Amino acid sequence: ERNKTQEEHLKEIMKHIVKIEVKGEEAVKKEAAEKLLEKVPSDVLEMYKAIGGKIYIVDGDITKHISLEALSEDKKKIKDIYGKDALLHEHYVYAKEGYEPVLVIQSSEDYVENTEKALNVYYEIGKILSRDILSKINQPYQKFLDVLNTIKNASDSDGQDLLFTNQLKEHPTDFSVEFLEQNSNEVQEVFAKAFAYYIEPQHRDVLQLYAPEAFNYMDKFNEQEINLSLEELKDQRMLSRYEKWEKIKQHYQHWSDSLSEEGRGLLKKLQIPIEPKKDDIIHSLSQEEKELLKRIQIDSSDFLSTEEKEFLKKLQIDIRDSLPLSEKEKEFLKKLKLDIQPYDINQRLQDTGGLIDSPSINLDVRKQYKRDIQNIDALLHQSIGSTLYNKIYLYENMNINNLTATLGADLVDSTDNTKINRGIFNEFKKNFKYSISSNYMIVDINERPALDNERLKWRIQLSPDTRAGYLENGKLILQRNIGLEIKDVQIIKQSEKEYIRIDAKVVPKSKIDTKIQEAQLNINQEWNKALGLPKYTKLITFNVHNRYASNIVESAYLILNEWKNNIQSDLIKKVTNYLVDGNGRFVFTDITLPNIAEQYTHQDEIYEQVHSKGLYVPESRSILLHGPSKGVELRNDSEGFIHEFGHAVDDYAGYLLDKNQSDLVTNSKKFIDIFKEEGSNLTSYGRTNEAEFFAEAFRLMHSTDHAERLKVQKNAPKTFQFINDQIKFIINS
């Protein structure tokens, strides 16, 4: 009842591109042409249509046709699917290239009994697919280069002995995107050829026999992926782009016409954050605060990013129209930091992962943000589902840093900033299975060019249920708390520049949350048994809310295996138990640290919050690890985590000392001296203070890279010996 729509869809498109012009009562020859083109993936025909192509089923010497009247002696001599040279006016198929593509097929009685012709026809169709269609959306590409390479560098040469020419066979190294750059026709042939073998039922088995990797590709591509190709092709068409924009503009017409003034004011301040105003900041500053603002070398501290540094710095300039540093001021600045933040709603949601009630900001602003959010939530009430259309893809241009600053640091090739580093790419695609949107996604109806720092191009498949708001500029504002499943990640070329296309499908946030919850439950069964804790204890927690969601979860495991394989099993158990006894937690999250209870719950003042890659909270006996960022030159998260476990070791040892109080062993005079001496030998960060030095040192000593283990030994021996004492002390005592 739904397959028939497909046959229905066929006849439709046929009506156009398929034009018969024969002698032998067309009713038959035509019937044959339908049975032949019926084997070809429906969407390839609509794509051919989209680019103005046409299929002509004529009689006799094919070159004896209007469309082929102009063919140049060179393009009059072809080569069949097998490489055998032929003469056009003697063959039965030909696909004319150009800004007015032509497919001419010689009307023959049988194409069934003749598995050879059919193969060739499909080969010229495949040639159309790769050369005339895919080429308009920059493909085949890297994904295909992969199938090609797998074929050659595979021990079984029979793969090559079927799809590659000798030109490809000889080529030494793998085929790089560069190769393809100046060999498009080469790849297109192979593509076309494999498409051919696949399409023609008889030669399909052969493909799957000697070139499985190829079969697979062409299989997946024709059974699904292709439809996305058609989608991208359409996105290139001006009229298609606008026909789409209109239907949607229409589906939300009432919603818009009825939208109030305030309504628009909200949608507006949600797209462009309000920066803090001097006349207010200055005005707010208490008498002493305002005064104290003059003895400050703002550039002194660190918790103030350059933007903030400069901003603050210009506050003096207005006050001057008149007549390191202490911690009382350090306090003053930790206070102003909060006040000089832009009022950025979506930002607020991302940072809190949706917990808009977090006491990580001053009550009044917390409230101001809640009011507006509860409102936008009310405004974005009408769902996208409509009778004006079915599947609807929306696009979003994203910055890799938003998901993982660490990989984002080496995403673009440093020699050619137009290419994407296959290395970081692979690592980035690795465990990216699901994503979550805690703030309002602002997507485009039709895909648009990106910004420089944006090398991520999302193609999202909305659910009819998904609510959204329409913007005049052709952008939709989706409702918060969306669930997204990653369906495909690949490298693509667009505008002589490489991008990572992410193909995602919207699903119920709960479905994703359940996965997170099931995982957190699983990870404890495992590490409770390893560490030997009570079967049902809650040690590790996944506080995952943002877009690189699944990853946070999959890296927690790996982080721990590292933690394990580098530190003494008995040190792990002794300290870990200490933590559990105090309800401690290993928190892996993607929301900024000042929004994790484990830290804010035990805060004195709010301005005393810390956001970083890692953090240890004695009061909660928990270790927090923020995944989306990049630790100050930490190779990876494993290290940062261990560094924190150092602060934990410091916290237990000190306790074992004088059990009557929670003091750090890193505070003992004996250590305050080792630090005063060797405390400048290891990482600069270690130079901060004893606790950080102890941890920095503790970390290097347990690095997966011994080169680093040696550094401590021959640079901070007095320390390397200290830490090792503390290790035995804890292990035994």
Partner: peptide, 9 residues
């Protein structure tokens, strides 16, 4: 609270 700060975005 003993951290290990990230790198300014």
């Amino acid at each position: 609270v003993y951290p290990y700060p990230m790198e300014p975005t």
